[PDB]
Give the backbone structure.
Amino acid sequence: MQIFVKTLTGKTITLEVEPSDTIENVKAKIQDKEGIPPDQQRLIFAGKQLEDGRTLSDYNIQKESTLHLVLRLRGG
Amino acid sequence: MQIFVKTLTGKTITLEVEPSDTIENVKAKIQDKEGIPPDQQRLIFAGKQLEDGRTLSDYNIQKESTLHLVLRLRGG
Amino acid sequence: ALKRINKELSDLARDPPAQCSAGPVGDDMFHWQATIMGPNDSPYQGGVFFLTIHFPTDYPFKPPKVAFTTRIYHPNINSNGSISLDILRSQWSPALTISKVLLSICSLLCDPNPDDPLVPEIARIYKTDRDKYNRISREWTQKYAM
Amino acid sequence: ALKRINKELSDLARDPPAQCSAGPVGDDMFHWQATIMGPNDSPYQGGVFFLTIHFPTDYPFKPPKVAFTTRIYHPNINSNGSISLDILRSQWSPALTISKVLLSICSLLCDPNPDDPLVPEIARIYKTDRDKYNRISREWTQKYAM
């Protein structure tokens, strides 16, 4: 399955995933392409902030859905 | 004469006034110090909401009395 | 109202608002949760702001109740998250959509209406000292919106 | 705070920080403006960077609010000029001085803290591609700091 992640710079990431992939797995794929650790990743979809231990189908994310990647500051 | 105005943020304003000063004049003094127009001003004392066309002595407000300044929304 | 709520929900699906998203929190269509990215122009940039949307039974005859859950420094938005926007009250139209409401809110963040404020002290700062307002607004974005 | 602000202001007068300066912008002691020369070692060399310092009423119990007004390419400094330095937040001490804060900032420019970044993409570049970070950092110095 194919989904999109939109960054604050206006770039679009193109990921290959499955509906059973966790939000943790997705952040790991985003790290493969962008080199940003999941630490500093934060995903938004359908008004929700996506939790790491849930799957894409839990949030009913489907093909061609666009996720929003934003900052996750631990305050430094 | 000296009176105090307490705001919702917990700040205390210190005003210089006279017993014959109208509530309109007092709100104008509050504007001088806080920059809030009388529009958005609302004063409470002795269980009453203070009317603009009456004097401090009408409400028998005297030295060291503390007035309460609260919001006056016109609804926007 | 349920059919109207679904049509709107799907509509966002085909043409999704940039830097915005919304959905039912759970299984209740009437109660939605939404996010707004701090607008690029604004001092809110980089913050993510969460909002709640509740649709009245009489919707769309009556406007949705919308509030901030994330804390924000705005003349038109109070500590409890309540919003002073015309579209939510006097100027509501059944013709209007949540997407429009979210767009209106984003615009509100870029350009506040100080003259008819919800917080008088913030409006005063925005008016007489824009630098201080931009500086404080930024402090709150990092403090509460990151 | 006013006496403390004056003592600090004068202190810089007797022992002035090299490649740094600060003062009240105008007649308000609480609001100061400061400059930092790009450190000789760093890729920021030759740039002049301006900063704002605002002292809280409770200073020095509470830290001064410091931000860049000049644009800069740094992992620890964002587009809005906000600074992620420990001394400004968790590690503040009333014992500390603006001179120390400016010194700390200069050190920060020489050696960024990527692992705890304010801009993740820049930190990634500094970490995996230092040459690209040094090259881009130089581009911005001329573009924005000269």
